């Protein structure tokens, strides 16, 4: 949604949940990276199920 | 301070000393389905201790830990303000 | 010199940008130089705590 140039994305979390939300965000980033690399490396001639 | 498996230690003490194995009873289940509280009892000989928790597992573990300590012992009107020095920490 | 006026070079060579208002904790305030009145006379200040 924050699609403008130099946009700011702000997260509000409490102190006790900082570690868990940081781990959650890293998990989301890892999922995004895995999606990207799976879409990149995979090659198929049939290209249809 | 409940670092470990206190129920395992409790049953270890029970069966090592040939004391009766730890009996466990569930008396009450109170609260709304998304905030139910569970109450688990533990009874060995004449000692009976209570453990409460959001889950039956947690309440059972707390009761076991409590009586494990027991058997070793006996052989504002205001919201707090926040500082303005908060910064934006990159993630 | 005299009634003639000239450009105020020092202020602009100092105030390229307005310094940002930052608070000071007791630890770093302890060894800071003691405030002296003539540095606070006829100047601009702001409350960083409020």
Curated annotation (Swiss-Prot), chain A:
In ovary (at protein level). Disruption phenotype: Abolishes RNA-induced silencing complex (RISC) assembly and RNAi silencing activity. Abolishes siRNA unwinding prior to loading onto the RNA-induced silencing complex (RISC). Decreased levels of endo-siRNAs. Increased susceptibility to infection with RNA viruses such as Flock House virus, Drosophila C virus or Sindbis virus. No effect on the processing of pre-miRNAs. RNAi-mediated knockdown inhibits the induction of the antifungal peptide Drs in response to M.luteus challenge. Also highly susceptible to infection with A.fumigatus, with 80% of flies dying six days after infection. Residues 4-16 are annotated as: Sufficient for interaction with loqs isoform PD (loqs-PD). It comes from the Eukaryota. It is found in: Nucleus; Cytoplasm; Cytoplasm, Cytoplasmic ribonucleoprotein granule. When in complex with loqs isoform PD (loqs-PD), undergoes significant conformational changes during the full ATP-dependent dicing reaction cycle for processing a 50 bp dsRNA with a 3' two-nucleotide overhang and a 5' monophosphate terminus. At the initial dsRNA binding stage, the helicase and DUF283 domains transition from an extended to a closed conformation, this anchors the bound dsRNA through major and minor groove recognition and forms the ATP- and 5'-phosphate binding pockets required for dicing activity. Belongs to the helicase family. Dicer subfamily. This is Endoribonuclease Dcr-2. The lineage of its organism: Eukaryota, Metazoa, Ecdysozoa, Arthropoda, Hexapoda.
Swiss-Prot record, chain B:
Disruption phenotype: Larval lethal and displays miRNA processing defects. Embryos do not develop past the first instar larvae stage. Most females contain ovaries with empty germaria accompanied by one or two terminal stage egg chambers. Accumulates pre-miRNAs and displays a reduction in mature miRNAs. Residues 5-73 form the DRBM domain. Residues 1-75 are annotated as: Sufficient for binding RNA. It is found in: Cytoplasm; Cytoplasm, Cytosol. It comes from the Eukaryota. Residues 63-64 are annotated as: Necessary for binding pre-miRNA. RNA-binding DRBM domains 1 and 2 bind dsRNA while DRBM 3 binds Dcr-1. The RNA-binding DRBM 1 and 2 domains are able to bind dsRNA independently. The DRBM domains appears to bind to the RNA duplex and then slide along the siRNA helix to the ends of the siRNA. The DRBMs display a preference for binding to the more thermodynamically stable ends of the siRNA which is enhanced by interaction with Dcr-2. This suggests that the domains may also function to pre-orientate the guide strand prior to loading into the (AGO2)-containing RNA-induced silencing complex (siRISC). Homodimer. The name 'Loquacious' refers to the mutants being 'very talkative' as they display a loss of several types of gene silencing. This is Protein Loquacious. It comes from Drosophila melanogaster (Fruit fly). The gene is loqs.
UniProtKB/Swiss-Prot annotation, chain C:
In ovary (at protein level). Component of the siRNA-directed RISC loading complex (siRLC), composed of at least Dcr-2, r2d2 and Taf11, which processes dsRNAs into duplex siRNAs which they then load onto AGO2 to initiate formation of the RNA-induced silencing complex (siRISC). The Dcr-2-r2d2 complex exists as a heterodimer and heterotetramer, with the latter showing higher siRNA binding activity. Interacts (via N-terminus) with the siRISC loading cofactor r2d2; interaction is essential for formation of the siRLC and consequently, formation of the siRISC. Interacts with Taf11. When in complex with loqs isoform PD (loqs-PD), undergoes significant conformational changes during the full ATP-dependent dicing reaction cycle for processing a 50 bp dsRNA with a 3' two-nucleotide overhang and a 5' monophosphate terminus. At the initial dsRNA binding stage, the helicase and DUF283 domains transition from an extended to a closed conformation, this anchors the bound dsRNA through major and minor groove recognition and forms the ATP- and 5'-phosphate binding pockets required for dicing activity. It is found in: Nucleus; Cytoplasm; Cytoplasm, Cytoplasmic ribonucleoprotein granule. This is Endoribonuclease Dcr-2. It comes from Drosophila melanogaster (Fruit fly). It comes from the Eukaryota. Belongs to the helicase family. Dicer subfamily.
């Amino acid at each position: 949604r924050a699609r403008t140039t130099e946009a700011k994305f702000v997260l509000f979390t409490a102190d006790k949940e900082r570690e868990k939300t940081i781990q959650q965000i890293y998990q989301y980033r890892k999922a995004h990276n895995d999606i990207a690399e799976y879409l990149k490396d995979r090659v198929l001639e049939k290209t249809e199920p | 301070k409940t670092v470990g498996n206190p129920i395992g230690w409790l049953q270890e003490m029970c069966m090592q000393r040939r004391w009766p194995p730890p009996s466990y009873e569930t008396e009450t289940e109170v609260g709304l389905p998304h905030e139910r509280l569970f109450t688990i009892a533990c009874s060995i000989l004449n000692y009976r201790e209570m453990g409460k928790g959001k889950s039956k597992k947690i309440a059972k573990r707390l009761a076991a830990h409590r009586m494990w300590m027991r058997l070793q012992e006996t052989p504002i009107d205001r919201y707090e303000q926040v500082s303005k020095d908060f910064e934006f920490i990159k993630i | 010199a005299g009634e003639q006026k000239c450009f105020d070079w020092e202020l602009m060579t100092n105030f390229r940008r307005l310094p940002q208002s930052h608070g000071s904790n007791v630890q770093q305030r302890e060894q800071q130089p003691a405030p002296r009145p003539e540095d606070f006379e006829g100047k601009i200040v702001t409350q960083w705590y409020a």
